[PDB]
Amino acid sequence: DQICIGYHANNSTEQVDTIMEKNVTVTHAQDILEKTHNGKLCDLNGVKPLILKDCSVAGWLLGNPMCDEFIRVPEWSYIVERANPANDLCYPGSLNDYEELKHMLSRINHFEKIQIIPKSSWPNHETSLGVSAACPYQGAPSFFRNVVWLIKKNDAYPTIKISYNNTNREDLLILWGIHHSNNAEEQTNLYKNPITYISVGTSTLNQRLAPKIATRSQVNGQRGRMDFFWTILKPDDAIHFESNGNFIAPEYAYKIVKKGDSTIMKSGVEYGHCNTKCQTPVGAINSSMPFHNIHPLTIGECPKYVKSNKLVLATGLRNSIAGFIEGGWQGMVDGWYGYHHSNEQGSGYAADKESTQKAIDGVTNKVNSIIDKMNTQFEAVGREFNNLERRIENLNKKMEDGFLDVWTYNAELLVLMENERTLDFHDSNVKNLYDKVRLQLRDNAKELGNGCFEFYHKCDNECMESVRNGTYDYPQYSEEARLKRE
Amino acid sequence: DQICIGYHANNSTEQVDTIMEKNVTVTHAQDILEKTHNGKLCDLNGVKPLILKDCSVAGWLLGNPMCDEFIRVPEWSYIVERANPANDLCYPGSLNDYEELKHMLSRINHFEKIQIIPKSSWPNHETSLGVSAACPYQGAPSFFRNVVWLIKKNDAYPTIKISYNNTNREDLLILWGIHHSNNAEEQTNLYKNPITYISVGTSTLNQRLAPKIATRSQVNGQRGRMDFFWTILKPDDAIHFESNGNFIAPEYAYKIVKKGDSTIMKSGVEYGHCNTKCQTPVGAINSSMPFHNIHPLTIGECPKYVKSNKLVLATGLRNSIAGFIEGGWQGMVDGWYGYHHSNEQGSGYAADKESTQKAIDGVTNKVNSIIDKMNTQFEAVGREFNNLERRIENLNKKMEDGFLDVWTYNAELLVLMENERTLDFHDSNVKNLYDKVRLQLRDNAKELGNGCFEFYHKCDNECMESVRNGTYDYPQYSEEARLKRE
Amino acid sequence: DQICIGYHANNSTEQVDTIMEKNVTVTHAQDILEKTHNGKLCDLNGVKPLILKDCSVAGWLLGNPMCDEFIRVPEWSYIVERANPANDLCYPGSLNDYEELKHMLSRINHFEKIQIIPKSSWPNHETSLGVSAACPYQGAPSFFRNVVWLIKKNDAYPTIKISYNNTNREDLLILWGIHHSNNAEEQTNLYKNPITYISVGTSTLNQRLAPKIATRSQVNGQRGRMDFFWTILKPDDAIHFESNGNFIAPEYAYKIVKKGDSTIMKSGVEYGHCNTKCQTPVGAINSSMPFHNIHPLTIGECPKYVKSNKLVLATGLRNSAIAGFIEGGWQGMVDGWYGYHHSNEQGSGYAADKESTQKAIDGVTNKVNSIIDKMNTQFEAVGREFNNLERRIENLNKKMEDGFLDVWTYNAELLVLMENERTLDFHDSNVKNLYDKVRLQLRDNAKELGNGCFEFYHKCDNECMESVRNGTYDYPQYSEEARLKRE
Ligand SMILES: CC(=O)N[C@@H]1[C@@H](O)[C@H](O[C@@H]2O[C@H](CO[C@]3(C(=O)O)C[C@H](O)[C@@H](NC(C)=O)[C@H]([C@H](O)[C@H](O)CO)O3)[C@H](O)[C@H](O)[C@H]2O)[C@@H](CO)O[C@H]1O
Ligand SMILES: CC(=O)N[C@@H]1[C@@H](O)[C@H](O[C@@H]2O[C@H](CO[C@]3(C(=O)O)C[C@H](O)[C@@H](NC(C)=O)[C@H]([C@H](O)[C@H](O)CO)O3)[C@H](O)[C@H](O)[C@H]2O)[C@@H](CO)O[C@H]1O
Ligand SMILES: CC(=O)N[C@@H]1[C@@H](O)[C@H](O[C@@H]2O[C@H](CO[C@]3(C(=O)O)C[C@H](O)[C@@H](NC(C)=O)[C@H]([C@H](O)[C@H](O)CO)O3)[C@H](O)[C@H](O)[C@H]2O)[C@@H](CO)O[C@H]1O
Ligand SMILES: *[C@@H]1O[C@H](CO)[C@@H](O[C@@H]2O[C@H](CO)[C@@H](O)[C@H](O)[C@H]2NC(C)=O)[C@H](O)[C@H]1NC(C)=O
Ligand SMILES: *[C@@H]1O[C@H](CO)[C@@H](O[C@@H]2O[C@H](CO)[C@@H](O)[C@H](O)[C@H]2NC(C)=O)[C@H](O)[C@H]1NC(C)=O
Ligand SMILES: *[C@@H]1O[C@H](CO)[C@@H](O)[C@H](O)[C@H]1NC(C)=O
Ligand SMILES: *[C@@H]1O[C@H](CO)[C@@H](O)[C@H](O)[C@H]1NC(C)=O
Ligand SMILES: *[C@@H]1O[C@H](CO)[C@@H](O)[C@H](O)[C@H]1NC(C)=O
Ligand SMILES: *[C@@H]1O[C@H](CO)[C@@H](O)[C@H](O)[C@H]1NC(C)=O
Ligand SMILES: *[C@@H]1O[C@H](CO)[C@@H](O)[C@H](O)[C@H]1NC(C)=O
Ligand SMILES: *[C@@H]1O[C@H](CO)[C@@H](O)[C@H](O)[C@H]1NC(C)=O
Ligand SMILES: *[C@@H]1O[C@H](CO)[C@@H](O)[C@H](O)[C@H]1NC(C)=O
Ligand SMILES: *[C@@H]1O[C@H](CO)[C@@H](O)[C@H](O)[C@H]1NC(C)=O
Ligand SMILES: *[C@@H]1O[C@H](CO)[C@@H](O)[C@H](O)[C@H]1NC(C)=O
């Protein structure tokens, strides 16, 4: 008859790393790194995003003749734009403060197009000959649909003086442009005025522009250029226009209410009719883990980006008639620590739930604390800088690289320390049990040194159960042990 | 006759959290988070700040009639400004590079106002008619006090040519402006010349401006605009002015010496006549703790900002005829570890000075190291970007959020781990005392298993003090114990 | 007659600090902080940097007469420039977008100067009178060598129209400028046209300029000013020029290929003819340590910067014939970390245990190597390129750098203290385990003196002592002898 103390073992082949040792096999393990995604675009908090397909923000706003598909978007959460849009500006030119406009238009609560100046408001000017071959429509010359190009009528260009007095209860977005001619003859043929000017004024805007006649290289078969501008009109403000040539008047305006911020995503994947909380250009994430390695650029409440490919926390035991010194028993299934009994009455395994429950609770609490002690907040990441702003881009790159390195180091070191701590805790528990069974039986038996005790006397099944319970009668078998000795 | 080992216990109720269990009860604890402030504005290192009350920087500099009295305060550390100043730019207009001037005027030493161009220097121009109803003073039209508005005299406006040596030994700040008319008739009424220009030139400045005549919405009953500019004059440089209309000439200049930098605070709290080191918009904070959660915006040597509400370190034992594994001893005052003694003379308590002193020193060193290993530097945090610089503001917000998350996570994890270590550090010391006593005792007594030893022989107070001291003579009582063993 | 346990001890005086104790003497220690440099400038990955000596970037590009060092370096890794260059611009003026051009003129794969407009292309204009005393050369007036200052000829200034196709297969860098006069008389004497203009146009450029005539201060004896501009020409684009006065036509153009990105170093150290990997204004760093405290500004893959002065990691034993419970200063053992000292009638000796020593050294080495190796290092170029009117972004950058420095310093110090504390107990645990293993094998044949030794009742000789070290002991063989010895 003998009593031994051992620990649970199984056929698991999972491996973890510690500070001192590498490739240690454990019975159970858990991963805290996210590495999967659905590979589709999904709604952000129930708000459908805006997809511009092959168009661009400038082309969509100005009304490119090949980009009239999008006319109904009451609201959106973020904008998805392809990396190299095809139809951006049919007529060569530029838009002032393009990046700021895109950043402002990222997230819009309400959007509606209205007409502010009917085409009938120009009795003394021609409004039908302003077409170009650089903006074809069904094989015919056309122009932008949201603006009107005015030319001379009856060989005369009377001065223009009109004003608009805002009556809606929301802000308005208004766009206008100026055209640069090629030579004096073309300027005379188009406007009859050798020298022209444009004046725009509001409560806060004071602008004056003049044409720049010169020679330029051909773009899309056209040597002219067009420059556009934009502004925001207050609910009770008014805007005044005045020009005598080279003026592109506005026709439609947008009603905008903004109560948030976002950025623009460059991706080519398709919509998927799904709801998510975190979005990446390659897919969506639906994980509660504190770390991930999918993609740097993310929108929304997302885990943190790290370089490591594996972060495994050890939660089980060290995998491998004897005792705890040799190895772990495979015959026991219930519990982590227990006793293997053996006598003439029978043999079997008995577990100790008192310490197993405490160990399980401790490990679970450690894992839960590590997972849940992390704070996350809404963030938007993107590239919003042009050619002549490289210094700020480099600063942002330094930002992201430093944060990535810090997080990677912290996570790796924390995992490495915690694995060893858990292993040492398990060893401490098993030795605590071994000394708990000790110092109670006294000299009635002898310790073979292999984790087992050989009773000199005879201990019944009830006696062994009482030993497990922690209540043992030493004087009951003291004389039997004494006469048994030698 | 028995000796038992135990530890201190009291009526405390503080609770601390570990990595494995939540709010175990401990006897003593220390907080390392600061959550209190005096709620007043105080001097920074003995330098009084600048309080503008209901004015703005531009209004204070230009001399708004209903805003400023005189300069005062030749030096200051930071500027306190209300969220929405009332008196600012009575005449509608704008100031060029407002944000840069605001940032540069944060911390200034030896700020003094001097007069450079007396009003007697304009004998051929009118100087007593440049007043407007948009800037009333005691019910009468007035204008800015630091600049002069020039009008035509005797239906004429001769060209102006003036230069200024800077004979002072410090840098000089000069401001001037240009006025935009409303129509040709008004321009002729104010100035005889129909076309005007302004030329300003220094060793590093080359500027030429022209007025812009157009129709604008009326603000404060005025449709005109005034744009102002500023520059820094070197100690031995000169500035040349040349104009023939629409010119606002300077009259006063400021002598400025700068060494350092700070930021502008938006707050409404009052002055309190105190000297602090860290300042927040809601009050002033002084402490040695490494963390705080008062306000994100701070100026000076302030602790780090975290989101947590509680951060408590454990510096004591676990609270709850006895023994080690029963609990604590309420009656055992004056010590952490010690011996409970009971002979035929009587019973009482005794403490082990050495182990308690080592434990106290270790805990104190741990706490002091955690507190003092923090590096603090002077910093100024504030919002200094306009409406057309949203991207940089987003970048700054990303900076602040990332740093806050990193600090919060690291602090929480460190607190949990150190609490875990410190909570069970003392158990090893108590175990060491126990088996030291057992090693000296050997088999002269019997272990009851609850933490005491039942003496077979008689041990008087001298023998008991010898046992505590570490001088036990086995052969002296061995024969008596052998006879009593049966 | 007795057997004892102990550990190695020596004559080192290294000191380390733990969380609970300070100034603890240890047998062996290792530092993980780099504090040395060669004090020289070296090549970066085999690419020699560009050293401009006393000439600034603008003067080198425009062709300042006092910068006659026309040495050709087709490819450079970074630019070394003095804090206050002397020869920058002989004629007072400014260069548009100077900072962006300087940033773009970092590491360049290919660079060559070619001629695009010969002087013979101006038959109706004077090209020999464009000299000034502000740009002396051998005691004679001169001008920039890369541009031409056009003056009126035969009291006439015909309008200029010219275009240039880029027939090369690489990007082109072109510079031009405009001159500001002082008064009407000077303008008439120089160009004969009271009103002038300049027009420049490409596929993406549309610029128009007009001279500004005013009175300015005297700098270098000249009251005039000169403003220069630059642009990048695509491999199949063209640029058109048109002006009627105050025009400074380009003569030479730079043919450039750009792949990477770098920054500019401000230092005065000399060249060293070395090939390093990390660069610093005060020298070069060659180490694999994760931390350093040399200089905040670095270029390349460099360790992290901290404000600490000492970072020592404990890897040895607690430095100071009975031991194991009392002072373990067993100076006799010089062949291991843990072992036994034996003594009987035959003799004595300081034996050692190989298994425990191997386990301990492997564990400590693994810890040190893991801490050193788990560093992610990437190429980062750190500099300070911001003008006088951009102080807010500079303050933002300074705040970022300070925050990162504080985080790294605090984390490193706390980690070092915690790891020293953790390491200074594994040896104690091993010694206690060895002492326990020595026990429960002799049982009652020996008396545990408590001092860290066992005294056998029976007679055990060298073979029996070697056996008990080996872990094989015959208790019944000496059981009766221990019985008869027990009184
Ligand atoms: C008055 C006229 O028609 N003159 C003819 C020249 O324009 C023409 O030169 C060719 O012009 C081509 C493009 O001309 C258009 C266009 O962009 O399609 C024609 C449009 O009617 C005109 N629109 C308006 C509202 O005036 C438009 C406009 O003038 C410019 O876009 C101004 O920026 O120009 C094309 O570019 C050819 O490459 C160019 O040679 C010559 C020769 O074809 O004939 C003239 O009769
Ligand atoms: C010089 C004068 O008396 N001009 C008369 C016009 O002012 C007047 O038009 C009315 O002008 C009102 C405001 O005019 C002031 C003002 O701001 O109070 C009058 C000031 O004397 C004048 N100051 C100077 C130095 O010239 C000032 C100035 O002209 C403008 O501010 C320039 O920006 O204007 C108010 O705006 C009324 O709405 C407007 O009708 C006309 C018609 O009565 O008579 C003029 O003689
Ligand atoms: C052409 C000439 O000699 N003109 C004389 C004026 O220059 C002179 O005024 C004095 O000018 C001095 C410098 O004049 C130079 C120079 O910078 O050395 C003379 C150069 O020939 C001339 N170069 C060209 C290509 O025209 C150059 C140029 O005019 C200016 O740099 C334009 O910015 O100027 C010096 O500044 C003296 O302080 C100044 O008084 C007057 C009176 O002496 O006589 C003119 O003949
Ligand atoms: C730690 O103590 C807190 C007491 O503050 C316990 O938290 C409370 O839990 C009850 C129900 O369990 C809630 O109704 C209270 O609102 C909680 N208080 C706070 C301040 O959150 C907590 O349960 C204790 N820890 C554990 C493991 O039970
Ligand atoms: C402003 O005044 C100072 C003081 O008179 C001028 O500096 C002097 O200039 C003359 C001739 O230029 C020299 O001979 C003196 O030696 C200078 N004195 C000092 C103390 O430097 C200065 O030139 C004047 N400013 C301008 C633009 O002329
Ligand atoms: C640890 O295990 C992995 C997986 O098999 C193996 O690639 C690696 O080489 C192992 N480490 C060592 C030191 O052998
Ligand atoms: C815009 O219209 C409202 C409607 O009466 C008017 O009160 C307001 O003054 C108008 N705006 C301006 C600038 O006059
Ligand atoms: C996310 O995953 C959980 C399970 O982890 C699942 O129940 C849920 O449907 C998924 N989607 C959302 C939107 O929560
Ligand atoms: C705890 O005991 C101390 C010791 O006298 C006493 O001063 C204190 O008031 C007690 N606290 C409570 C809550 O009873
Ligand atoms: C901090 O302020 C408190 C006021 O509540 C004061 O008692 C204390 O002395 C101050 N500490 C220092 C170092 O000034
Ligand atoms: C310390 O001991 C080593 C070992 O022999 C010896 O080489 C060295 O000289 C000694 N140093 C001192 C200062 O005693
Ligand atoms: C630790 O040693 C250093 C160097 O000898 C000394 O400067 C310092 O004061 C010592 N610390 C203590 C607490 O004695
Ligand atoms: C440059 O030459 C090529 C050669 O065919 C020609 O196609 C191109 O049009 C030329 N550049 C311009 C601006 O015309
Ligand atoms: C850098 O230092 C290592 C270690 O001493 C050495 O092997 C290597 O040759 C050094 N490299 C250079 C370029 O000096």
Short mmCIF file of N, CA and C in Angstrom, two decimals, chain B residues 319-383:
data_model
loop_
_atom_site.label_atom_id
_atom_site.label_comp_id
_atom_site.label_asym_id
_atom_site.label_seq_id
_atom_site.Cartn_x
_atom_site.Cartn_y
_atom_site.Cartn_z
N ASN B 319 -5.24 40.91 5.80
CA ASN B 319 -6.09 40.93 6.98
C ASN B 319 -7.20 39.88 6.86
N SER B 320 -7.85 39.61 7.98
CA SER B 320 -8.94 38.64 8.02
C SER B 320 -10.04 39.08 8.98
N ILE B 321 -3.30 30.87 21.68
CA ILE B 321 -3.79 29.61 21.13
C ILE B 321 -4.19 29.81 19.67
N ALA B 322 -3.19 29.91 18.80
CA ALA B 322 -3.40 30.07 17.37
C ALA B 322 -2.15 29.54 16.66
N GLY B 323 -2.04 29.84 15.37
CA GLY B 323 -0.90 29.36 14.61
C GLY B 323 -0.71 30.17 13.35
N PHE B 324 0.25 29.73 12.54
CA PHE B 324 0.52 30.40 11.27
C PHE B 324 -0.72 30.38 10.38
N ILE B 325 -1.17 29.19 9.98
CA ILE B 325 -2.34 29.13 9.13
C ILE B 325 -3.60 29.07 9.98
N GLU B 326 -3.96 30.21 10.58
CA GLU B 326 -5.28 30.42 11.14
C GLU B 326 -5.78 31.80 10.73
N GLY B 327 -4.86 32.75 10.67
CA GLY B 327 -5.17 34.15 10.47
C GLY B 327 -4.17 35.01 11.21
N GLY B 328 -4.58 36.26 11.48
CA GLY B 328 -3.74 37.19 12.20
C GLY B 328 -4.00 37.19 13.70
N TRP B 329 -3.21 37.98 14.41
CA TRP B 329 -3.35 38.17 15.85
C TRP B 329 -3.70 39.63 16.11
N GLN B 330 -4.93 39.87 16.57
CA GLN B 330 -5.35 41.24 16.87
C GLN B 330 -4.58 41.81 18.06
N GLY B 331 -4.32 40.98 19.07
CA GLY B 331 -3.62 41.45 20.26
C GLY B 331 -2.13 41.65 20.07
N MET B 332 -1.56 41.20 18.95
CA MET B 332 -0.13 41.34 18.69
C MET B 332 0.14 42.71 18.07
N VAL B 333 0.22 43.72 18.93
CA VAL B 333 0.62 45.06 18.51
C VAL B 333 2.14 45.13 18.49
N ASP B 334 2.68 46.19 17.89
CA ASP B 334 4.12 46.47 17.88
C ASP B 334 4.91 45.33 17.24
N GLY B 335 4.66 45.15 15.96
CA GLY B 335 5.43 44.20 15.17
C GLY B 335 4.59 43.59 14.06
N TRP B 336 5.29 43.05 13.07
CA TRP B 336 4.67 42.35 11.95
C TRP B 336 4.76 40.83 12.10
N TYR B 337 5.93 40.31 12.46
CA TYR B 337 6.12 38.90 12.75
C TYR B 337 6.59 38.75 14.19
N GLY B 338 6.25 37.62 14.80
CA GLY B 338 6.65 37.40 16.17
C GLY B 338 6.14 36.07 16.69
N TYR B 339 6.34 35.87 17.99
CA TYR B 339 6.04 34.61 18.65
C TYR B 339 5.02 34.85 19.75
N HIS B 340 4.03 33.97 19.84
CA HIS B 340 3.13 33.93 20.99
C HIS B 340 3.64 32.86 21.95
N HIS B 341 3.83 33.24 23.20
CA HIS B 341 4.47 32.38 24.18
C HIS B 341 3.48 31.98 25.27
N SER B 342 3.63 30.76 25.77
CA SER B 342 2.73 30.25 26.80
C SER B 342 3.46 29.17 27.60
N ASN B 343 3.85 29.51 28.83
CA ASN B 343 4.42 28.56 29.77
C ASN B 343 3.55 28.54 31.03
N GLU B 344 4.01 27.81 32.05
CA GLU B 344 3.25 27.74 33.29
C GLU B 344 3.30 29.04 34.08
N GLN B 345 4.28 29.91 33.81
CA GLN B 345 4.29 31.22 34.43
C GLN B 345 3.16 32.10 33.90
N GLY B 346 2.89 32.02 32.60
CA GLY B 346 1.85 32.84 32.01
C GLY B 346 1.91 32.76 30.50
N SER B 347 1.29 33.75 29.86
CA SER B 347 1.24 33.82 28.40
C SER B 347 1.38 35.27 27.96
N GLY B 348 1.75 35.45 26.70
CA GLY B 348 1.93 36.78 26.17
C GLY B 348 2.38 36.74 24.73
N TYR B 349 2.89 37.88 24.26
CA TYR B 349 3.34 38.02 22.88
C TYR B 349 4.75 38.60 22.85
N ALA B 350 5.45 38.31 21.76
CA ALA B 350 6.79 38.83 21.53
C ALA B 350 7.01 38.93 20.02
N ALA B 351 7.70 39.99 19.60
CA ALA B 351 7.90 40.27 18.19
C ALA B 351 9.36 40.10 17.80
N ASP B 352 9.59 39.73 16.54
CA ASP B 352 10.93 39.59 15.99
C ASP B 352 11.29 40.89 15.28
N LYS B 353 12.25 41.62 15.85
CA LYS B 353 12.56 42.96 15.34
C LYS B 353 13.24 42.91 13.98
N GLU B 354 14.17 41.96 13.79
CA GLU B 354 15.01 41.97 12.60
C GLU B 354 14.20 41.75 11.33
N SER B 355 13.38 40.70 11.30
CA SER B 355 12.62 40.39 10.09
C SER B 355 11.64 41.51 9.77
N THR B 356 10.99 42.07 10.79
CA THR B 356 10.07 43.18 10.57
C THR B 356 10.80 44.38 9.99
N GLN B 357 12.00 44.68 10.49
CA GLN B 357 12.75 45.82 9.98
C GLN B 357 13.18 45.61 8.54
N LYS B 358 13.66 44.40 8.20
CA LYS B 358 13.97 44.12 6.79
C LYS B 358 12.74 44.27 5.91
N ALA B 359 11.59 43.75 6.35
CA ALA B 359 10.39 43.83 5.53
C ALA B 359 9.97 45.28 5.32
N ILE B 360 10.00 46.09 6.38
CA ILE B 360 9.62 47.49 6.27
C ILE B 360 10.57 48.22 5.33
N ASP B 361 11.88 47.98 5.47
CA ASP B 361 12.84 48.63 4.58
C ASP B 361 12.61 48.23 3.13
N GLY B 362 12.34 46.95 2.88
CA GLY B 362 12.11 46.51 1.51
C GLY B 362 10.89 47.14 0.89
N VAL B 363 9.78 47.17 1.64
CA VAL B 363 8.55 47.77 1.11
C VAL B 363 8.75 49.26 0.86
N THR B 364 9.41 49.96 1.79
CA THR B 364 9.66 51.38 1.61
C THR B 364 10.54 51.64 0.40
N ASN B 365 11.58 50.82 0.21
CA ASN B 365 12.44 50.98 -0.95
C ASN B 365 11.68 50.74 -2.24
N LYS B 366 10.81 49.73 -2.26
CA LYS B 366 10.01 49.47 -3.46
C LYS B 366 9.13 50.67 -3.81
N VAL B 367 8.41 51.19 -2.82
CA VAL B 367 7.51 52.32 -3.07
C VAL B 367 8.31 53.54 -3.52
N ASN B 368 9.42 53.82 -2.84
CA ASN B 368 10.23 54.98 -3.19
C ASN B 368 10.81 54.86 -4.59
N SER B 369 11.27 53.67 -4.97
CA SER B 369 11.80 53.47 -6.32
C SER B 369 10.71 53.69 -7.36
N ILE B 370 9.52 53.13 -7.12
CA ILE B 370 8.43 53.30 -8.08
C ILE B 370 8.08 54.78 -8.24
N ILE B 371 8.06 55.52 -7.13
CA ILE B 371 7.70 56.94 -7.21
C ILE B 371 8.81 57.74 -7.89
N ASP B 372 10.07 57.48 -7.54
CA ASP B 372 11.17 58.35 -7.91
C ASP B 372 11.83 58.00 -9.24
N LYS B 373 11.50 56.86 -9.85
CA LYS B 373 12.08 56.53 -11.14
C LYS B 373 11.39 57.24 -12.30
N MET B 374 10.60 58.27 -12.03
CA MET B 374 9.87 59.01 -13.05
C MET B 374 10.64 60.27 -13.44
N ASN B 375 10.72 60.51 -14.75
CA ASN B 375 11.41 61.68 -15.30
C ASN B 375 10.37 62.69 -15.76
N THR B 376 10.51 63.93 -15.30
CA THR B 376 9.57 65.00 -15.60
C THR B 376 10.28 66.13 -16.33
N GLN B 377 9.62 66.68 -17.35
CA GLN B 377 10.15 67.77 -18.14
C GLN B 377 9.08 68.84 -18.33
N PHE B 378 9.53 70.07 -18.55
CA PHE B 378 8.61 71.17 -18.79
C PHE B 378 7.93 71.02 -20.14
N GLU B 379 6.61 71.15 -20.15
CA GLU B 379 5.83 71.01 -21.37
C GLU B 379 4.68 72.01 -21.36
N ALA B 380 4.24 72.38 -22.56
CA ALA B 380 3.10 73.28 -22.74
C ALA B 380 2.13 72.63 -23.72
N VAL B 381 0.92 72.35 -23.25
CA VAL B 381 -0.09 71.65 -24.04
C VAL B 381 -1.26 72.58 -24.27
N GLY B 382 -1.66 72.74 -25.53
CA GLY B 382 -2.78 73.59 -25.86
C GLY B 382 -3.15 73.43 -27.32
N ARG B 383 -4.27 74.05 -27.68
CA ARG B 383 -4.79 74.02 -29.05
C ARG B 383 -4.42 75.33 -29.74
#
